[PDB]
Design a protein around this nucleic acid. Structure first.
Lengths: 95, 234, 213
RNA sequence: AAAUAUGUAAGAAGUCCUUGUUACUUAAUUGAACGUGGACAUUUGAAUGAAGAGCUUUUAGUGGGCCAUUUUUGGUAAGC
RNA sequence: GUGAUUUCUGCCCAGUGCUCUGAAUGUCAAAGUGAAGAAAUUCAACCAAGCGCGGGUAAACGGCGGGAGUAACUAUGACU
RNA sequence: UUGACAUUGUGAAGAGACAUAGAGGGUGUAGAAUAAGUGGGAGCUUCGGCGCCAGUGAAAUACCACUACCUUUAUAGUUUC
RNA sequence: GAAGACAUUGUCAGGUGGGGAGUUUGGCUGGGGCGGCACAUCUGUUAAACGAUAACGCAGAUGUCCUAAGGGGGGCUCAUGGAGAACAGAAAUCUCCAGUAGAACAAAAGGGUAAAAGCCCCCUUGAUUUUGAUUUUCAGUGUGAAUACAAACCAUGAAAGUGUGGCCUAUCGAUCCUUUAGUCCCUCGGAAUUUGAGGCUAGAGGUGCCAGAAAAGUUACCACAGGGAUAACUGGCUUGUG
């Protein structure tokens, strides 16, 4: 809900410490397919017929994920530090 | 759910004609190339296949065809390729006229002739034209086919006219329709048959309920109804 | 291709010509690139010059309009029209929203939409060449049209577009290609990760080509 | 602004006196926390009671409860 | 499927089913092809049916609206 | 039901592989004028053509690199549709 | 004679496929059901002047919203009379003056709050890192929330201070899995080298039945084990309603 791209949120790393303006994007996703142990074993059925696994998965959602705020300085040289704002829906800096 | 009728029969089960109660059998004989004689003594009355089958020639040292509406209980059943055309005879449809009409007639050469063997239905040879070696034949059906040059041929309308132009007045006579073939009669107006019974599926206030066309290719059991169709009403 | 050959597009490519000696009149070089290729809306730019340094080169009529007061926001200068009785019929669609937001530069108008911009006015125009950018739209479209006319720097928005410069005729090499880079800032890089985001481009001056990659 | 009920405290290891320790904060003879040497305890409101007292393991059943008097919730009411 | 004869088969193909050469184009699996690494491997493009688009189809499943005004006592509807 | 791969090998018409890119180039309303079009452009070349600082319109171009139509054009062995 | 690599046969892939197989179909409830959520929460009360405390008790709020609606210092002080009125003239809105906290603090209700905790300005990003301890069921269970410290690192003021998110009391989530942020740390077990896999610590991704199964009906053809724990009928209170 209007965040402001980069703002001196003290922080560290370290090999730095103190403050440091951090270009702060929010976090995205990441494919896995055919690497995940989750897979390495979850490839089954067992096997002339199957089903899945106890948690798969139709429950009842919440209609509000979370902002994966990903603050990250440039002088501290590292390291893209995650934070957690919770309240949806919203969006970056307006304002 | 049980195994709905249709599914039910087919296999030996308990149904299969009068396979030991009739006369001989179809048979336009075997195959030489230039006419042999045929004195056709007596026309038979069999069962099932109404329309007299009549037993004939026996010449090369001493067969029983289905006989087009033409028996002189001794009739001129001379047949074989080079052979005076006529009601009777049977010449290789590769040497007919153009608008004739053979009854018994063999898909593929030789192999005794069944195409339009039934009561009456004849097979007007309408075509002959486009022919390196074949024939544009009609068919009792209503569709067309190019049979193959020299292939038997009745030569005349199959006997037994309106075997059923009408009118089976009474539930009997079905006294026959059977004592003939299978036990096809009576026939249990399915949609009384209960849920588990056949596929129909009575249900409370009657109802053929949902659908009725029946996709060709369903599970021999999902089957039945109106096969798989291209239409409906009158 | 961000390699040694940059000064082959610059140093070795600074006196190619196509005839005899090398003429007798002034020069004219630069360093081609773009704006961000994003979509001229969400994210692609901010603030900070390179330079760079330039202006038009040819025409500058861009985009600025909204109400009956947006016309005078394009009178003592020259821009496109959004119309009044058109945002409810035909002020946007494909060749429409284009018209007003489809020039060359980008856009320098203000804001006023309501529940209509997910597939019409504000919408259909973005990556086309405009979708409500930062042109200090409050006093008008001239002072912030220093970011939309001259000086510059090199406001790079809408569809590609930008600028570059360093010297005149011949006196640059490592700082010629490294002057082309210098002729690039919030257009070659920026905040969180931005050292590169494209595939290729072009450049020269007037001679012949630059990088042969 | 009650009554009933409800926290604490009690004679007493307690004060009183002497100084000693450093990470603490005071500018420190500033204190803090801790510890030595020294005076007096059976103690002069609290009462009343002790079949010591403390402590450790373990392992049953139980988890459907129901009455009354007062104080109350619903409900015309109820052996609700 | 419906049930002698007799008469009589209204209108609905959007929905669900069925079904046709049909659609100038979008998905669409396995092998087969290309691209990249050192490969493992991971990106690609095209790709049968099918799908979705087009048509027919109700003696196929089944369907068959609702409110306003609206003179020549009065209520009234062939009216709109 | 459909595809691929095996069962499956004799011959014969036509693509694609080895082992290729170049020219006219833009039929809304307006600017004397070539609009799916971009911009680097103040210059290209001993001329000044067009520019351009002016520029309207739905979008401005000669120095032209290009994200994209039409017309226009070479095979000798295996290979494979 | 017909058929002529075709088809067929076989192996995988995809369509299709209630014909067939298996499998499931929350709970609290004046009896089951349709309904409502006292299934997770918060304020007020009910609740008997510490705490605790019941209903399908009464009156209400909760699955968000805030980059500032956070953080510090300045200033200032919030819904009447009597004055000046031109589109204003009941006033919508403008400027003067002289006194009950009646206003305002996002959102329910209650607490609280006046050189403020409200309003106008000024400057920032503490809504920060590491832990741990605490408090919240009369609390021994993890959770969310909140309190005081330590160590860092900042803000802000001249300072002393204050600030570890929205004045306080509501506004959220285990277990495998997956993704990411972390040293560039640990191992692939005959040695290496990279590629990959695996680990450690800090997060996001869902569980609302919110201590966290992944789940359609119908039976009047039906069936079983138990329920006066549980409804039709008698009786029973009670008698509103007659």
């Amino acid at each position: 809900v209007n965040v402001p791209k980069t703002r001196k949120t003290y922080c560290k790393g370290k090999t730095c410490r103190k403050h440091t303006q951090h270009k702060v994007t929010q976090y995205k996703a990441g494919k896995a397919s055919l690497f995940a142990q989750g897979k390495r074993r979850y490839d089954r059925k067992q096997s002339g017929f199957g089903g899945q696994t106890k948690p798969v998965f139709h429950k009842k959602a919440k209609t509000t994920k979370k902002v994966v705020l990903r603050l990250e300085c440039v002088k501290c040289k590292t390291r893209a530090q995650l934070t957690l704002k919770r309240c949806k829906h919203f969006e970056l800096g307006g304002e | 759910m049980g195994r709905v009728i249709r599914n039910q029969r087919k296999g030996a089960g308990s149904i299969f004609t009068s396979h030991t109660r009739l006369r001989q059998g179809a048979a336009k004989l075997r195959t030489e190339r230039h006419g042999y004689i045929r004195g056709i003594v007596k026309q038979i009355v069999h069962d099932s296949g109404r329309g007299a089958p009549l037993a004939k020639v026996v010449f090369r040292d001493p067969e029983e065809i289905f006989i087009a509406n033409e028996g002189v209980h001794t009739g001129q059943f001379i047949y074989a390729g080079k052979k005076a055309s006529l009601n009777v005879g049977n010449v290789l449809p590769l040497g007919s006229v153009p608008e004739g009409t053979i009854v018994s007639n063999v898909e593929e050469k030789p192999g005794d002739r069944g195409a339009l063997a039934r009561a009456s239905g004849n097979y007007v040879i309408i075509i002959g034209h486009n022919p390196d070696e074949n024939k544009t034949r009609v068919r009792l059906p209503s569709g067309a086919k190019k049979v193959i040059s020299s292939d038997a041929r009745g030569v005349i309308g199959v006997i037994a006219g309106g075997g059923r132009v009408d009118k089976p007045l009474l539930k009997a006579g079905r006294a026959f329709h059977k004592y003939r073939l299978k036990r096809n009669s009576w026939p249990k107006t399915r949609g009384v048959a209960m849920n588990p019974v056949d596929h129909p599926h009575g249900g409370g206030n009657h109802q053929h309920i949902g659908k009725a066309s029946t996709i060709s290719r369903g599970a021999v059991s999902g089957q039945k109804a109106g096969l798989i169709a291209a239409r409906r009403t009158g | 291709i961000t390699s040694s050959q940059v000064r082959e597009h610059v140093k070795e490519l600074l006196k190619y010509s196509n005839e005899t000696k090398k003429r007798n009149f002034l020069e004219t070089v630069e360093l081609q690139v773009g704006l961000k290729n994003y979509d001229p809306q969400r994210d692609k730019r901010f603030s900070g010059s390179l330079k760079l340094p330039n202006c038009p080169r040819p025409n500058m009529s861009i985009c600025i309009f909204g109400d009956a007061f947006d016309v005078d926001r394009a009178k003592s200068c020259g821009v496109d029209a959004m119309s009044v009785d058109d945002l409810k019929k035909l002020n946007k669609n494909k060749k429409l929203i284009k018209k007003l937001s489809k020039k060359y530069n980008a856009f320098i108008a203000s804001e006023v939409l309501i529940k209509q911009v997910p597939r019409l006015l504000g919408p259909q125009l973005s990556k086309a060449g405009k979708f409500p950018t930062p042109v200090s739209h409050n006093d008008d479209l001239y002072g912030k049209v220093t970011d939309v006319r001259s000086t510059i720097k090199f406001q790079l928005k809408k569809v590609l577009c930008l600028a570059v410069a360093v010297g005149n005729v011949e006196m640059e090499e490592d700082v010629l290609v490294n002057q082309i880079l210098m002729s690039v800032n919030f257009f070659v890089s920026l905040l969180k990760k931005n050292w590169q985001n494209v595939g290729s481009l072009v450049v020269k001056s007037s001679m012949g080509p630059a990088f042969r990659l």
